[PDB]
């Protein structure tokens, strides 16, 4: 699955406790191509995600360096 | 439930057929206070809905008339 993220915003940082677990929920809106990652009812990450219909290997050719 | 809708968008109009039925699907994103109505995977409405915390009945007082 090639993927294309777009307009990702990290609203807050999650600290991993030395003991225990942190549970993250991920919710998608396929019609709007949008996703929200939440933590205990607080927004953590938001943006758009969708499958890349036509991958082009040219996109990963290294640009000529300015220096 | 006193509600509040913000930034509502109607993307396409759904035609109720003479026979049969149309299925509409509502997906809520509590963290982002957003919703989405979809029909067969096509976005029909988008926006924000959330509970009105403290209704202020003054808001419904009739505004000073234009004439």
Curated annotation (Swiss-Prot), chains A, B:
Coiled coil: none
Localization per record: Cytoplasm; Melanosome
Post-translational modification: In adipocytes, S-nitrosylation of Fatty acid synthase occurs under physiological conditions and gradually increases during adipogenesis.
Tissues and organs where the protein is expressed, per its UniProt entry: Ubiquitous. Prominent expression in brain, lung, liver and mammary gland.
Stated role: Fatty acid synthetase is a multifunctional enzyme that catalyzes the de novo biosynthesis of long-chain saturated fatty acids starting from acetyl-CoA and malonyl-CoA in the presence of NADPH. This multifunctional protein contains 7 catalytic activities and a site for the binding of the prosthetic group 4'-phosphopantetheine of the acyl carrier protein ([ACP]) domain.
Additional information: The relatively low beta-ketoacyl synthase activity may be attributable to the low 4'-phosphopantetheine content of the protein.
Oligomeric form and interacting partners: Homodimer which is arranged in a head to tail fashion. Interacts with CEACAM1; this interaction is insulin and phosphorylation-dependent; reduces fatty-acid synthase activity.
Name of the protein: Fatty acid synthase
Species name: Homo sapiens
Lineage per the UniProt record: Eukaryota, Metazoa, Chordata, Craniata, Vertebrata
Residues of the full protein shown: 910 to 976 of 2511
């Amino acid at each position: 699955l090639p993927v294309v993220f777009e307009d990702v915003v990290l609203h807050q940082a999650t600290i991993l406790p030395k003991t225990g677990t942190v549970s993250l929920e991920v919710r998608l809106l396929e019609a709007s191509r949008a996703f929200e990652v939440s933590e205990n009812g607080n927004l953590v990450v938001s943006g758009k995600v969708y499958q890349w219909d036509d991958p082009d290997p040219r996109l990963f050719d290294h640009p000529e360096s300015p220096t």
